[PDB]
Write an enzyme that holds these catalytic residues in place. Structure first.
Site, PDB file in Angstrom:
ATOM      1  N   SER A   1       7.810 -19.188 -35.474  1.00 64.18           N
ATOM      2  CA  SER A   1       9.061 -18.469 -35.740  1.00 64.18           C
ATOM      3  C   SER A   1      10.282 -19.381 -35.779  1.00 64.18           C
ATOM      4  CB  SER A   1       9.291 -17.353 -34.704  1.00 64.18           C
ATOM      5  OG  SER A   1       8.195 -16.418 -34.747  1.00 64.18           O
TER       6      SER A   1
ATOM      7  N   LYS B   1      12.153 -19.077 -38.950  1.00 64.65           N
ATOM      8  CA  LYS B   1      13.110 -17.988 -39.283  1.00 64.65           C
ATOM      9  C   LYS B   1      14.491 -18.591 -39.527  1.00 64.65           C
ATOM     10  CE  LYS B   1      10.899 -14.010 -37.009  1.00 64.65           C
ATOM     11  NZ  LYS B   1       9.591 -14.660 -36.776  1.00 64.65           N
TER      12      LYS B   1
ATOM     13  N   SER C   1      12.612 -12.168 -32.640  1.00 65.89           N
ATOM     14  CA  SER C   1      11.559 -12.817 -33.410  1.00 65.89           C
ATOM     15  C   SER C   1      10.710 -11.814 -34.188  1.00 65.89           C
ATOM     16  CB  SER C   1      10.690 -13.717 -32.527  1.00 65.89           C
ATOM     17  OG  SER C   1      10.215 -14.800 -33.336  1.00 65.89           O
TER      18      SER C   1
ATOM     19  N   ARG D   1       9.206 -21.527 -22.119  1.00 66.95           N
ATOM     20  CA  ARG D   1       9.857 -22.427 -23.066  1.00 66.95           C
ATOM     21  C   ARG D   1      11.332 -22.555 -22.723  1.00 66.95           C
ATOM     22  NH1 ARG D   1       8.046 -18.819 -28.023  1.00 66.95           N
ATOM     23  NH2 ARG D   1       8.970 -17.396 -26.484  1.00 66.95           N
TER      24      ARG D   1
HETATM   25  B1  OZ9 Z   1       7.219 -16.300 -33.661  1.00 69.22           B
HETATM   26  O1  OZ9 Z   1       8.009 -16.090 -32.547  1.00 69.22           O
HETATM   27  O2  OZ9 Z   1       6.559 -17.504 -33.470  1.00 69.22           O
HETATM   28  C1  OZ9 Z   1       6.369 -14.976 -34.118  1.00 69.22           C
HETATM   29  C2  OZ9 Z   1       6.798 -13.674 -33.363  1.00 69.22           C
HETATM   30  C3  OZ9 Z   1       6.477 -13.792 -31.850  1.00 69.22           C
HETATM   31  N1  OZ9 Z   1       5.089 -15.482 -33.517  1.00 69.22           N
HETATM   32  S1  OZ9 Z   1       3.579 -14.647 -33.854  1.00 69.22           S
HETATM   33  O3  OZ9 Z   1       3.509 -14.285 -35.277  1.00 69.22           O
HETATM   34  O4  OZ9 Z   1       2.359 -15.471 -33.751  1.00 69.22           O
HETATM   35  C4  OZ9 Z   1       3.384 -13.103 -32.869  1.00 69.22           C
HETATM   36  C5  OZ9 Z   1       2.359 -12.156 -33.559  1.00 69.22           C
HETATM   37  C6  OZ9 Z   1       1.002 -12.189 -33.211  1.00 69.22           C
HETATM   38  C7  OZ9 Z   1       0.082 -11.341 -33.836  1.00 69.22           C
HETATM   39  C8  OZ9 Z   1       0.515 -10.442 -34.812  1.00 69.22           C
HETATM   40  C9  OZ9 Z   1       1.864 -10.399 -35.157  1.00 69.22           C
HETATM   41  C10 OZ9 Z   1       2.382  -9.429 -36.227  1.00 69.22           C
HETATM   42  O5  OZ9 Z   1       2.083  -8.205 -36.206  1.00 69.22           O
HETATM   43  O6  OZ9 Z   1       3.136  -9.874 -37.133  1.00 69.22           O
HETATM   44  C11 OZ9 Z   1       2.785 -11.247 -34.534  1.00 69.22           C
END
Ligand code: OZ9
Length: 244
Positions: free
Chosen positions: A50, A53, A97, A230
């Site tokens: 993320s 972003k 996020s 973090r």
């Molecule tokens: B980022 O902060 O790195 C983003 C949002 C926390 N990270 S992630 O995409 O890996 C969290 C995530 C995990 C599984 C499924 C989803 C989804 O539904 O988009 C997000």
């Protein structure tokens, strides 16, 4: 009058005690400093997760794919996190996020323009592959901690190749903490879709006097860890160095 050996030992211990492996890179002017308990991570490539972003927002705003007050409506489908089941501006989605909002923005930009813009900015390995909606989460896009702190340095100083107003708009979305007279602007990342998982916190401190000190924390996230580690390691490191 604290020795460098003591600062290095203290910051290393923050990562050790969190039971992970990581680095934090600090940049002062043109000079990089690397601390933590796994210094070789500094020039290794990881997905940006993320942290991308920040660039997605710059690209979407510069190219008129969104405005800063536009409300991205929740489509009513279940989300991975309950907090994402609401209508959000880009800035609110930055703070939460909220992957779905930034996936919508990436789809508006579209693959051709996204790839051209990521190449124009020269971000990381610059490769977005064929899937416009997940290339920052599962590859092929990758970036090193040195590259992330240099990107933070560029954004903090309005040096990226976007309008000044675009960069100021995105920087406003990144304010995460105020400590005494210091302000911390940063974006977290957690790549849960790669093995091992990567954690990031990349941004800069704006001190009361106006100096900006970029940083990038990169660590391995492990099962059952809290995302707040973090932030906690970062703030403890910045405080130990007297940056906040
Ligand atoms: B980022 O902060 O790195 C983003 C949002 C926390 N990270 S992630 O995409 O890996 C969290 C995530 C995990 C599984 C499924 C989803 C989804 O539904 O988009 C997000």
């Amino acid at each position: 009058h604290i020795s460098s050996q003591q600062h290095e030992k203290a910051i290393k211990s923050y990562f050790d005690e969190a039971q992970t492996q990581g680095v934090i890179i600090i940049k002062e002017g043109k000079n990089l400093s690397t601390y933590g308990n796994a210094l070789a991570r500094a020039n290794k490539e990881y997905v940006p997760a993320s942290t991308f972003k920040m660039l997605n927002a710059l690209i979407g705003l510069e190219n008129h794919k969104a405005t800063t007050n536009e409300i991205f409506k929740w489509d009513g489908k279940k989300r991975t996190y309950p907090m994402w089941e609401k209508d959000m501006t880009l800035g609110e989605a930055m703070a939460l996020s909220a992957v779905p909002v930034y996936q919508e923005l990436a789809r508006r930009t579209g693959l051709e323009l996204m790839q051209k813009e990521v190449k124009r900015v020269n971000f990381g390995n610059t490769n977005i592959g064929t899937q416009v909606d997940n290339f920052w989460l599962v590859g092929p896009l990758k970036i090193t901690p040195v590259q992330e702190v240099n990107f933070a340095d560029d954004l903090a100083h309005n040096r990226l190749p976007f309008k000044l107003e675009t960069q100021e708009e995105v920087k406003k979305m990144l304010l995460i903490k105020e400590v005494n007279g210091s302000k911390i602007y940063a974006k977290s990342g957690w790549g849960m879709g790669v093995t091992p998982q990567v954690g990031w916190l990349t941004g800069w401190v704006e001190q009361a006097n106006g100096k900006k000190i970029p940083f990038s924390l990169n660590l391995e996230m492990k099962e059952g860890m809290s995302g707040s580690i973090r932030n906690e390691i970062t703030y403890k490191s910045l405080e130990n160095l007297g940056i906040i």
